[PDB]
From a paper:
We report here the crystal structures of two neutralization-escape-resistant human monoclonal antibodies in complex with their peptide epitope. Epitope II is involved in binding the cellular receptor CD81, which is in line with the fact that the HC84 antibodies inhibit binding of E2 to CD81. The structures reveal a short α-helix in the epitope projecting two hydrophobic residues into a hydrophobic pocket in the paratope, which we propose is similar to the interaction with the receptor.
Therefore, we performed co-crystallization trials at 20°C as described in Materials and Methods. Both complexes crystallized and diffracted to at least 2.2 Å resolution. The peptide corresponding to epitope II forms a 1.5 α-helical turn spanning residues W437-F442 displaying the typical extensive main chain hydrogen bonding pattern of an α-helix. It continues at the C-terminal side of the helix in an extended conformation comprising residues Y443-K446. The peptide is bound such that the N- and C-terminal ends interact with the heavy and light chain, respectively. At the heavy-chain side, the paratope forms a hydrophobic binding surface with contacts to W437-L441 within the short α-helical turn. This surface extends into a hydrophobic cavity into which the aromatic side chain of F442 at the C-terminal end of the epitope helix inserts. On the peptide side, analysis of the solvent-accessible surface area that is buried in the complex shows that mainly residues L441 and F442 interact with the heavy chain, with 60–90% of their solvent accessible surface area buried by heavy chain binding. The main contact residues for HCV E2 binding of both monoclonal antibodies have been mapped to L441 and F442 by alanine scanning mutagenesis. In contrast, a superposition of the variable domains and the peptides of both complexes revealed only small differences, indicating a very similar antigen-binding mode for both Fabs. This was expected, because the two heavy chains are essentially identical (apart from three residues at the N-terminus) and the light chains share ∼76% identical amino acids in the variable region.
Residue numbers in the entry:
A (entry chain A): 1 to 28, 32 to 132, 139 to 221
B (entry chain B): 1 to 213
The structure:
């Protein structure tokens, strides 16, 4: 029942530092940090054993990585200094049993975006609706990634397609989240998209209903 | 340092058996661990110490390691198995991962359901118009989407996005967005997206006239 919970998505200027936290919720082992650049593979950054106060780091980070822990609070930390645009990745913390070599518990990941640019929250617009109808929400002009989209506060999951973001000519992202529903439900049921953009602190709820 | 070699892709029909190889110089001398990563999710340990299996992992997942090749075998492949699979070892005080193998499920031709969405009134206020064409639940991934404005074929003003294989039916979905100024959008009436796909006898067009309800 232990769950590794990580800190939220961040934008960091190049030449700066990032500290990512990993909390062992209903728990307390080897703590590992693995990163993933978008569309690429898993890359080990290092491990740390708080009990033996021992750390092992990966070569290829120029000694910019520091892994720490606080046993009092059961939170693990990864600090990465001298951030460059190549460090834009999802950062995973993972826990494995002592001397075993594998990681049976993983955190949800933290997307760290290395950018000189300022954060921009999205504008959310509705995609208004035989037997099956389609509706959705357009999530336009945001930076950086990621955005999350739920339907009816998570009650509606079936028939949902949230598309990968496209990078527009503006250098900003845009995505659509769509859902197919029964035509008979339009006029009865209420469909709302819940959009969240953590880097900008934007939280928008938008109703996708047919025109007058 | 030590190199793990995985093929980038493996494709299998439902009910069939997938074999994901992990090549390494005398990999049989090491303990091989396997992770499954579904799109937008964290990796999940599926096989540890060559052939052992964690609690919630189906018996259909099995591992083997001898000589220069470790293999993850997935029997009776389902749409829920679509993911990227990574092998991992420890070598000279370092964690080494394979480059990953994407598992694609080979399903039948499925025609898309096509929907067109006009720009919202709220967006029009901002001086920009986004017209969206939706291709829902089709296979294979290749689809030609053509935008037509007052019968004039559009070019360089649309972008497409495609979902990963559906976890339940193995299809894809595509969104095509046509971006115009409020000026250009208001200068025309007929908005259409024409869809060419191998699951359709002839191309399907979905259209709307700027102004109707």
């Amino acid at each position: 029942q232990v769950q590794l919970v990580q800190s939220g998505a961040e934008v960091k200027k190049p030449g700066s530092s990032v500290k990512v936290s990993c909390e062992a919720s209903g728990g307390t082992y080897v703590i590992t940090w693995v990163r993933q650049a978008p569309g690429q593979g898993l890359e080990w950054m290092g491990g740390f054993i708080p009990t033996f106060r021992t750390a092992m780091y990966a070569q290829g980070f120029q000694g910019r990585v520091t892994i720490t822990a606080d046993e009092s609070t059961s939170i693990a930390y990864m600090e990465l200094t001298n951030l460059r645009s190549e460090d834009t990745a999802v950062y995973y913390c993972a826990r494995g049993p002592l001397s075993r070599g594998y990681y049976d518990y993983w955190g949800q990941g933290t997307l760290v975006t290395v950018s000189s640019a300022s954060t921009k929250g999205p504008s959310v617009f509705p995609l208004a609706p035989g037997g099956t109808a389609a509706l959705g929400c357009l999530v336009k002009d945001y930076f950086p990634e990621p955005v999350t989209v739920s339907w009816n506060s998570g009650a509606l999951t079936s028939g949902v397609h949230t598309f990968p973001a496209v990078l527009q000519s503006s250098g900003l992202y845009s995505l659509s989240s769509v859902v197919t529903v029964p035509s008979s439900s339009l006029g009865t049921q209420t469909y709302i998209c819940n959009v969240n953009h953590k880097p900008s602190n934007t939280k928008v709820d938008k109703k996708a209903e047919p025109k007058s | 340092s030590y190199v793990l070699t995985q093929p980038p892709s493996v494709s299998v029909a439902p009910g069939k058996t997938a074999r994901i190889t992990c090549g390494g110089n005398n990999i049989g001398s090491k303990s091989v661990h396997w992770y499954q990563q579904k799109p937008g999710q964290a990796p999940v340990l599926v096989v540890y110490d060559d052939s052992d299996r964690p609690s919630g992992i189906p018996e259909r997942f099995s591992g083997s390691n001898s000589g220069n090749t470790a293999t993850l075998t997935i029997s009776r492949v389902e749409a829920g198995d679509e993911a990227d699979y990574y092998c991992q070892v420890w070598d000279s005080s370092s964690v080494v991962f394979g480059g990953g193998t994407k598992l694609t499920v080979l399903r039948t031709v499925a025609a898309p359901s096509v929907f067109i969405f006009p720009p919202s009134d709220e967006q029009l206020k901002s001086g920009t118009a986004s017209v969206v064409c939706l291709l829902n639940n089709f296979y294979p991934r290749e689809a030609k989407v053509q935008w037509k404005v007052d019968n004039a074929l559009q070019s360089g003003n649309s972008q497409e996005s495609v979902t990963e294989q559906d976890s339940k039916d193995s299809t894809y979905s595509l969104s095509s967005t046509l971006t115009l100024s409020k000026a250009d959008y208001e200068k025309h009436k007929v908005y259409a997206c024409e869809v060419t796909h191998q699951g359709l006898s002839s191309p399907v067009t979905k259209s709307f006239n700027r102004g109707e309800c």
